[PDB]
Structure formats: C-alpha cells, structure tokens
RNA sequence: GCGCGGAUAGCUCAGUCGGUAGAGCAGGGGAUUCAUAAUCCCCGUGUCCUUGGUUCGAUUCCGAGUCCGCGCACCA
RNA sequence: GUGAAUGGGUGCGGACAGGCAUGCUUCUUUGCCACGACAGGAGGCUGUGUAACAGCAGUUCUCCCCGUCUUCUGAGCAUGUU
RNA sequence: AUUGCUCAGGCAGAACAGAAAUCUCCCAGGGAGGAGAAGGCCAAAGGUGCUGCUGAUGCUGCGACUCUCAGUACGAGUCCGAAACGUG
RNA sequence: GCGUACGGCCAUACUACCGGGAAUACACCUGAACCCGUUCGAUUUCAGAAGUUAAGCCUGGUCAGGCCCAGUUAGUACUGAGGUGGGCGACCACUUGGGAACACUGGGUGCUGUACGCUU
C-alpha cells in the first residue's frame, strides 16, 4: 500500500525500533568493542602470516 | 490563479485523511533529530505553528539546527537553472525521520558485521537478471490457450 | 412519525474513534503532549514525571519516562505497602498519600544512588523546603502529573506531591495548593499543613466523635477500633512509620522493619 | 436456576430507585419585577439561593430580549427533595398521568398556587405557578456524571417509564392516569 | 496593441543548457543561525582543549592503567596454551 | 447589451446607515342638516415587490430573479 | 471513504566508508568522585585456511562481563587508532 | 493563561406554555463555534463560561530564515538567545 | 488465567443487544469535623469501609451495523511511448510498457511495553 495509514504505521514502526536501537545500544557497544578486537587480532595475524612467509 | 498566498491551492494539499483528524501523538514528540539526520518536511495541519511553505512538502533535507520545539532543515530547491539551499526552520510537528537512507545502513552494517566477525556474504545488490536453462520436469498438462468467441452480450451485460 | 436514524451505516462508516485511553476516561492527551514533549536540544533526555493517582482504597504514586513502546516506571509506590512500615490503618489518607510520597522520594533516591545525600526534611515541618543541590549529582528532578484529578487547595495529590518534596526528590512547586495557603493573603499556614500531614484532623474528629456521639465513631472508622488504633496515637503513628520509611525505603516483607 | 439467578439478580439491593433530584422551576417572561419574587419564593420552599435563567433568543411574541432574565429555579436533592416532592404530590392528591413519565423514567408535575405547598404569606410576593421535576436514579449512576474513568450506565441499570410509573405507585401510594 | 504576455516555453531548455546544480555542495555553512546555546558551547569546548601531546600521555597513562592485571593473565594464558595444541593433536 | 432609481393600507407620497410603520385623500360607524356635501367625534386598513446571511431581531443589511422607469449607445 | 499512468525529493560507502579508544565544554543531565580504588574464575581460545573444520601463527587472548566500589546523562567539537 | 464544561439539531417530559420562553433526561464526529470571503484546522479543544492578566514591538543602530523573488526591498510569517512579566 | 497504575499504535479496539465474572484489585458505595467547592457534598474535596457485582471494567455470543483482511472485480477502467493505424468526425482498435476503484464473496472482531500484585 502506500496509503497514509500504512506510511504512518511505517513511520511508527521505524520510530520504535530506532528506540530498541538506542536502548540496547551499550550492549551494542561492548559487543561492537570485543568485534575490533577480533578484527585487530585477525589483521595481526594476517601481517605475522606474511612476515614468516617471507 | 491570481492570489499567491503563503496557503494557496492547498485544499487537497493541506486536508487531513479519513478519520486522521486530530492533534499528533507522542511518537511524534518522542522523535528524535541529530544535526546531519534526513527528514521528510511533511506538514500536519492539525499544528498551525511553525508550519513549512507548501513548496517543500515531500522534499527530504538533513538537519543543520536543533531548537528547543523546532528544527532546521537544508533542502534544496531549484529555482529555474540552479538550485539552491532553502533554510527553513519547522517544527518537529512537520517533519519525520527520514527511511531514504535505511537500506544503505541495513546494507553498510550488514557488510561490516561480515567482515568483523567472518559470517554473511556482503551484499552488493545487482538488478534482477536472466536465468539460466533448467529442464523442468513439470508433471502439469498445459491449457489450451487462444482467442475466445465474440458475445455482444457478455460484452454489454445489462 | 418516526425518527430519522442518526446512527446510521454511514454515520459508523464515517466516525472517527477516540484514541483508547481516552475512551476510558484515564489519559489526558493535552496535559500529556504538554508536560511530556522535551526539548529537541535535549536528544533523548526524558522528564521524569511524579504521576500521581487516587481510587477508592489506595493511592499510587510512580516515577514515569514516556517512551514510544511504552511508559517505563521508576520506584513505584502504592498506599497499600505502608503497613510493612508501620501504618496500619487511615491509609489514603492526608496522612497516608504524605506517607506514600515519601517511600516514593526514599526508593527512588535509592534506585539512583542519592539516597544518602540528598535527605530532605526528616522530622515533617509545614513549611517549605526545596531541596538545596551539593558539589556532585544534582537532586533528582521530577515534574508533577495530576492527570484527570482536580486540583483544590488541600488535595492529596498535593499531599503525595509534599511527600515526595520532603523526601528529597525536586519536584518544582509552589505552595498555592497546599492545606495551610491563604489565596486571598498569598501565604501559608505550616502548622495547620502539618496537622493535616500527620492526621491531626482525623485524630481531632475521632476525639471529637468519643466525646460526643459514641455510635457515629463505630459507623464510620469501624477498622480504626478493629484495630489496635485509638485517636491519640494516630500522629506518631504516622511519624514512626516515616522514620521506619526511612530507615528502610525498598522494603516489601514485615521481617525488615518489625521483629528486631 | 437460570431463572433464579436472574431474578436475584434484579432484586439486588443496589438496584433501589432512589430521587436523584427535584427541579423547582419558576419561568415567569419577565425581568425583575415578579422575577425578584419568584426567586424569593422558590428560595423559601428550598433552603438554598436560587440560580437565574435568562431568554436564550429574542422572542418579539411572549416580550423577551436575549440574556434577559426571565426564570428562575433550584435543584434540591435529599431529604428536602423528598419532603418538597410529597408536597407537591399532596397537592395534587397522589394522583398522576402516565404522560408525566419520560421515556427515561424521570416525571414531572406543575402547580398553580404554591400557598397549599405549606408557604405563609401570601401578597408579599404573590402566588406562583410552578414545575416540580423530580429525576430518579440507582445508586450507581454517578458512572456517567464523573470525568475520570466515567462510563456510562448499562441498559438493565437503566430506569424505564414502567418501573418509574410503578415505584411512584408504590412510593407515595398513588394513581396513574392513562 | 493587445500582447501574450505570459509563457513557459523555452524555460526548460535555457534551465538545462548548463547542468543545474548546487553552487556549494562541499562548502561548510555558516555557524549564524545556528542555536546560541551551541555556539557558545562550541567555543567554550574549543577553549578548553588539550594539547595533542598532553592527550597522547593521556591515553598512554590509560591504556598502562589495566596492564598488570592484563600481562599477568596473558602470559598465564600463553603458558596454557601449548597444552592446548598438543591436546588439539589428539583428534 | 451599459450605468442608475424606484416596488410602503384602495390612490399618491414619507420612513430606506439593523429594537414593527406614518401624512393627505379614500373606505366603515356616530353627529349637525329636511337631505347631500362641506364640518365635528371615531374607527379599522399595510408579512413595507420576493427572496438569503439574519447581530437577538430587518421596510430599514447584503445577494439573485421578477415589475416599472430612466439615461448611455460615439469615430462607423 | 479509494486512487493510478506519467511525475517530484532523498539515499545507494574508503581502499572520504565503517568500527574502536580518549579528550574538552561555562551547553544538557540526577548522572559527579573517576585521567580513581579494587578484582576472581572457567577455557582444545583466537585468527588464517575447510566442509573437511586437517593443517599453520600466537597478538596486553575468549567468556562470566566491556566486572565490583550506590556506578557511571547526552550533544557538539576535537585528539589518536584501524 | 489556568480551569470547568460541550456544541448544531433531535426524541421524550414539566403550570400558564402553544411550533417557538425556561427546566430535565437520553442521542448526537462536530451536521456548532472560532469577527468577516472561501478553504484548511480544532472536542476533557486554537470552541466556550468564570477568573486573573497585558507576551498586542522579547531593552539594541539585535539574528537566521520562509513566501514573494532579481533569490532585492516593503509586507507577512516561522524559528531562536536572554531581561522583565501574565497564568498555572 | 488475570487486576491496577502509566502508556504506544488508535475500531480486528467502535455502536447496539443478549449472557458470565475466582483472587488481587478497580468500581459502585457511607458520612460532612476539618482542607476545598458548590443554586444542590450531584460534580468536587475531605474522612471512611456497612453492603454489592446491579451498573462501570473485563469477558463470551451475533452469517448484528461498522471496521479489518483475503479473494474477486480484472488485466476491466485508465494510462506513458509509437504509427503516413482506422474514422468525416465522435472516438476506436493495434504495438510496446504501467495498471486500479466501487461493488460482490467469504473470514475475522486488538496487539503489546514498564512497574506493582493476584492467581500460589
């Protein structure tokens, strides 16, 4: 539909989850944390992959 | 149509919905704007305050100021051969979160969850392409398709 | 000669509905949108409301931040938990509604951690206290909502509201509703505030109604006698059940504040 | 037992018709004259001040202005609504006609003289016709007369012109006319 | 005498002789209009910044603060772990 | 087609910028007169062309259509 | 009360994206002390390579938990890192 | 500005009183009202009673804007900062 | 399986009629010394707890009215692009795309968040 009831329900829908979004949000960030780590923990081993090989 | 009023030729253009009257709700002022947000200038009649011009009412802009009932809005318009960058100042009450860019953060987060963590595969969204050949066993007869009868009577029912 | 039917298909077909807390007589929506809409400046910093609320047999009091999924409640506190603190009868009283505003103010302060800093006014005056900030945390700050309640000069909600105030949450207030106010004069009368904030009127009228009339005294405050209750006592009992408030505000079985 | 629970259901006790209220109305089209006398008189059969009813539209056939006062009246409720309603059904003898009854179950009656109401004096302020509107109720009514959680009053709850014609009859002992 | 005065014939093609575009789209806009509350705020915040060397010993003091804690249990993890591959050899 | 004015008791005119209406004559009753007229004492007579906001009320306010009359209609 | 076709606004990323840590503020917040004090346990864990996950490397490791001490408001602007 | 209330119209009822005076009950999404043209808007109300007020020029050689538009002015209007106030 | 307070979306939630409701409640309910307000303690304020689920509230039913949903109307109406297509026109067909609406048929008749309880 594209009715103005359906777009507002849309709308209200958006609003809710952006508020789930910000209210789970800390947890979001230390779980978003713990992932650079992971993801510095992999270019390391990427980079002392490359430096044994050569 | 010799009067250029600041509310002219807005009868279908300002009118509510059926059975959408009334003042807006909670969801409304429990919004949230950040400088930078897209939003949608949609004007509600039922708030005769702060009220944007009718020449931006389906234009998406992004926040430049924050007041305390109000928010600034840079919308482009053009004017004949350029564009130009409208400052309008409207209420919380004329505007919503704008979705235009929520595909593109769906899709980025998705893309940087897959590469943080080494589940998913990326989206990059192609168009919808042809298929390949099958051989489609397909146990179903097909129907006899073709032109029917011409009946002036089951053209021009009564 | 009949009546022309008013409700009619398109009459239902084209009647827009109120909205549903509205039809039950319990939301007012201008009174909402007005004291709920924050400042835009203030992204996502809520108001803290006092909504305060009366029936029959009890008053609630609730620290409330409006959300869209819904309301969220902060320290909640019913006139019905006053008797694990020692108030046993005369509850939604003046009394009682001063008595559940402070619980309210105590196991807020608790839930945020300013409990023991901000304290208030300890032994209840009449008169006024706002509550002075220190060098840290700032008093907890919370904005009164009365709802479909009408206010009058001497009303419990503003007896919940004083709890609150003296427990030590910042609530802004003048005392234009308050027992002891004069309009007229513009000032207020803290002893006659304070008689009322610790039942002086329902003691006096239960004095009043032994001394003469011995039949009316067990028609109506039948459960006062019912109980170990007598007008005299009634005053501090109310002010040992604040004490006992105090002392232990998130309280809920009798073994905490009884039995030591 | 159907039937037997239905039945005690309608003679719950708080299912008693009671007086909600008396209305002693007094509309005299003038204003001031007879109209200072009428409230004098409509506040000696109450005990209370009376409240002035003005023309709502200029009406140049029965001489009223607009916001001219031209009635007065008084709602008593209690029991000297009781007493003033047993002395208006004294007056007129108990009887009543069935088209005094509403299609809500609230009745009316007017008198001529208000002299046999029990009222002394007479020339002082003259004789006054007068309505006597006596509206009934439940205890339970106040449903839809609060604001907060106020709903509105259920169809079995509700008083009709037949139980009002025969608790007036039961009440007061007295007649109905066809 | 009696004109036609009003047309908007060839005001597209004038309009997209040039491609129509936005004079500063990069540009940064001007902070007047901006809430006062913010400017201030801003030049406040601004006056009382640090040093980029001060925030580098800063951050250094912070990421030293947790290090005991975390180089102890860090060697203690390594020293387990080649126990942990001998015993992933027996699968 | 243009611009304007007007429709008030049987006749002729007032009242036309919102709190129901008049003047003269007329008509009906009484009187004076032998009788009529004049004269005296009285009386009734008008939804103010017809239609709509109507400020609470409209002859009296605006808005159309009827009916009557007026003026303009040039260089062509 | 519905509502097209054609249309209009916006968005569709760096190799400036995205994430992470920290700073400042007289602005906001109840949300400061604190750029502070204290702190245990479990663990074939983590990454590259694979549907055979074998193998190979060890980087202030992974989880309880971005812990506890009443428990740590945001916003804007910056400093670093990736 | 607080606050209470709910409007047009209608059924039914009450001495004079009737179609139409005033009173009572039920129904009524707005068919009312908001000065006026039309449109939009609005129901524990941007209606209305009562009351309190004067924010009917937010101190300045005081801002950003929007309609108009040449992106000029006047005008009109939106949004802010903070003095002093009204109401609560 | 529910109650109350505050809500979000604001009829699958409303309107009418017929029934049922355990507990906590909520509610009706009783009085006027005080605070307070009324022409009237009706509303309202205060103070209570004798009684009752009668009403409010919740809940079950209705080929109820409404509302919602799916089908269907219907590839119908309309329509962007195209033709040295037809037609005197009115307008229609075709090529390439887009594609409803009412009506009709039938089914359904709130979901849920925070807190405090009941049911244990």
């Given amino acids: 539909n594209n009715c103005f009831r359906r777009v507002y329900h849309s709308n209200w829908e958006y609003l ?3 508020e789930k979004e910000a209210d789970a949000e800390p947890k979001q960030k230390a779980l978003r944390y713990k992932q650079e780590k992971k993801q510095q923990f992999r270019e ?11 | 149509p010799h009067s250029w009023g600041k509310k002219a030729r807005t009868r279908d253009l300002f009118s509510k919905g059926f059975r959408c009257h009334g003042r807006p709700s909670l969801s409304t002022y429990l919004a949230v704007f950040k400088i930078g947000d897209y939003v949608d200038v949609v004007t509600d009649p039922s708030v005769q305050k702060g009220q944007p011009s009718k020449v931006f009412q389906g234009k998406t802009g992004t926040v430049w100021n924050v007041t305390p009932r109000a928010v600034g809005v840079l919308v482009n318009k053009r004017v004949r051969g350029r564009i130009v960058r409208k400052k309008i100042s409207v209420r919380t009450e004329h505007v919503r979160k704008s979705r235009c860019q929520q595909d593109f953060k769906e899709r980025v987060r998705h893309n940087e969850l897959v590469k943080r963590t080494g589940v998913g595969k990326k989206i990059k969204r192609q168009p919808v392409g042809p298929r390949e050949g099958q051989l489609l066993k397909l146990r179903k007869k097909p129907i006899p398709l073709g032109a029917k009868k011409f009946v002036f009577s089951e053209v021009y029912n009564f | 000669m009949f009546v022309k039917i008013v409700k009619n298909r398109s009459y239902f077909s084209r009647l827009q509905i109120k909205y549903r807390r509205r039809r039950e007589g319990k939301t007012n929506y201008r009174k909402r949108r007005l004291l709920v809409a924050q400042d ?3 992204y996502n910093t809520p108001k803290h409301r006092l909504c305060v609320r009366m029936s029959n047999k009890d ?6 931040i409006a959300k869209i999924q819904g309301d969220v409640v902060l320290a909640a506190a019913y006139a019905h938990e006053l008797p694990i603190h020692g108030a046993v009868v005369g509850l939604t009283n003046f009394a009682g509604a001063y008595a559940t505003g402070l619980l309210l103010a105590r196991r807020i302060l608790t839930k945020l951690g300013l409990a ?6 300890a032994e209840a005056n009449g008169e006024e206290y706002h509550v002075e900030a220190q060098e840290g945390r700032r008093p907890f700050k919370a904005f009164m909502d009365t709802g479909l309640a009408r206010v009058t000069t001497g009303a419990r909600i503003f007896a919940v509201l004083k709890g609150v105030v003296d427990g ?7 005392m234009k509703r308050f027992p002891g106010y004069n309009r007229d004069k513009g ?5 006659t505030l304070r008689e009322r904030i610790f039942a002086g009127h329902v003691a006096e009228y239960q004095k009043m109604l032994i001394r003469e009339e011995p039949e009316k005294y067990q028609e109506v405050y039948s459960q006062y006698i019912a109980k170990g209750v007598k007008p005299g006592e009634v005053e501090d009992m109310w002010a040992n059940c604040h004490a006992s408030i105090r002392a232990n505000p998130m309280a809920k079985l009798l073994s905490e504040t009884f039995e030591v | 037992n159907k039937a037997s629970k239905r039945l005690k259901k309608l003679q719950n006790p708080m299912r008693e018709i009671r007086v909600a209220k008396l209305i002693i109305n007094i509309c005299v089209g003038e204003s001031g004259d007879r109209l200072t006398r009428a409230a004098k008189v409509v506040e000696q059969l109450t005990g209370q001040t009376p409240v002035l009813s003005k023309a709502r539209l200029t009406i140049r056939s029965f001489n009223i202005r607009r916001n001219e006062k031209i009635a007065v009246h008084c709602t008593v409720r209690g029991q000297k609504a009781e007493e003033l309603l047993e002395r208006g059904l004294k007056v007129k003898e108990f009887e009543l006609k069935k088209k005094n009854f509403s299609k809500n179950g609230n009745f009316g009656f007017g008198i001529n003289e208000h002299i046999d109401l029990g009222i002394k004096y007479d020339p002082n302020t003259g004789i006054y016709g007068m309505d006597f509107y006596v509206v009934l109720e439940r205890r339970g009514f106040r449903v839809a007369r609060k604001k907060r959680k106020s709903g509105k009053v259920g169809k079995a709850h509700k008083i009709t012109k037949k139980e009002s014609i025969k608790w007036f009859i039961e009440k007061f002992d007295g007649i109905v006319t066809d | 005498a009696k004109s036609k005065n009003h047309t908007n014939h060839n005001q597209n093609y004038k309009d997209h002789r040039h491609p129509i575009r936005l004079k500063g789209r990069r540009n940064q806009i001007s902070s007047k209009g901006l809430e006062q509350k913010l400017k201030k705020n801003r030049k406040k915040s601004r006056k009382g910044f640090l040093t980029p060397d001060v925030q580098k010993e800063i951050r250094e003091k912070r990421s030293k603060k947790g290090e005991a804690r975390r180089l102890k249990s860090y060697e203690k993890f390594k020293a387990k772990l080649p126990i942990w591959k001998a015993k992933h050899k027996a699968a």
């Avoid at chain 1, 390391?44 to 050569?54: H, I, N, Q, R, S």
């Fill in chain 1, 16 to 18: 809710l989850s952006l």
């Fill in chain 1, 44 to 54: 390391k081993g990427l980079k002392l992959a490359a430096a044994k090989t050569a």
């Fill in chain 3, 40 to 42: 835009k400046n203030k």
């Fill in chain 3, 59 to 64: 008053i609630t009091a609730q620290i409330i």
């Fill in chain 3, 116 to 121: 023991d800093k901000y304290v208030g006014v």
């Fill in chain 3, 168 to 174: 030590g949450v910042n609530v802004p207030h003048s």
């Fill in chain 3, 187 to 191: 000032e207020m009368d803290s002893e």
